[PDB]
Design a binder for this molecule. Sequence first.
Ligand SMILES: N#C/C(=C/c1c[nH]c2ccccc12)c1n[nH]c(N)c1C#N
Ligand SMILES: N#C/C(=C\c1c[nH]c2ccccc12)c1n[nH]c(N)c1C#N
Length: 334
Amino acid sequence: SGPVPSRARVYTDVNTHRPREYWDYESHVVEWGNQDDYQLVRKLGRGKYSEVFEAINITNNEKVVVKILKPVKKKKIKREIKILENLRGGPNIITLADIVKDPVSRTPALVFEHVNNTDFKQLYQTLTDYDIRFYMYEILKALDYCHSMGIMHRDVKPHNVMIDHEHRKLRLIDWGLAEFYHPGQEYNVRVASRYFKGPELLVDYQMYDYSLDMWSLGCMLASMIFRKEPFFHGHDNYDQLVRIAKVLGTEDLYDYIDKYNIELDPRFNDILGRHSRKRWERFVHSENQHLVSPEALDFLDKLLRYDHQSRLTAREAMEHPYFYTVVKDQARMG
Ligand SMILES: N#C/C(=C/c1c[nH]c2ccccc12)c1n[nH]c(N)c1C#N
Ligand SMILES: N#C/C(=C\c1c[nH]c2ccccc12)c1n[nH]c(N)c1C#N
């Protein structure tokens, strides 16, 4: 007896009514820019499948970021490209400025707009209550947009949210794990960073959807308002679910498992133990209380739910009273 099927309760059939070309990334034909337009300046970091450089566009002296892709399935590169082109211009979505390659070796690279980021390990220490509300709202705009365009990000975490704080400018980056949502599809659960993996991933429930990103977002919120990063700190994927259970409680976890007829690894129920659901107020201390409000705790509570169908959508989240003062500020006459 296998697990009960599931489908997204929003944007379920966005890709269904799109032209095949929209989601059939395998058939996408890349339009290549010119490699010689860019000069590498400094290495910023290294992914498992890429190397990331600060660069300059020499035709206009603008800073950019160049991500050189290591040898990998072309299918994976084409998926990231198609997704970035589909979402280009969307609110707080990183802009893919160009796609280039060594014309002889064919080694390809993605070129992005530059964000003058403050590393989150430094920045979050200094964020005010209003700053958190504001940037959470910006992330929600990006997620509602990509979800409405039929795409799951699947790697929401502080490292993938670039913030130029003095310009109050936020971009959601690294779309390398993102995928098109098709109802009934069984997806790879090996996505997202350990600390931001939703319960569905940790229990190997493959028929997940956009709501995975809302779990990850709730993990970020908790880490910001409680000044504990990451909030759920497991030592491996099994222990990650234990850390969640110690806060959300084991009864609601086993209710979730039961509802979807999920078969848990035998090892789990010995390490999961029995835990009451904790009040979110328990994590409020003198040092973080200026970032916590009844509205913050109510909002967080509505994101961090075992049942993916029970989590707020990005659109529902933007309606929450937590964002009242932010929404007025955004109401811009310009
Ligand atoms: N240096 C160097 C490399 C340069 C490039 C290869 N394509 C590119 C496309 C646009 C801009 C630079 C390169 C490189 N090629 N292959 C790697 N793994 C590299 C590294 N680092
Ligand atoms: N890593 C990475 C990326 C950006 C940065 C990493 N450290 C930084 C330090 C200062 C300024 C920008 C970055 C990045 N990855 N993908 C993109 N589109 C990016 C942009 N911008």
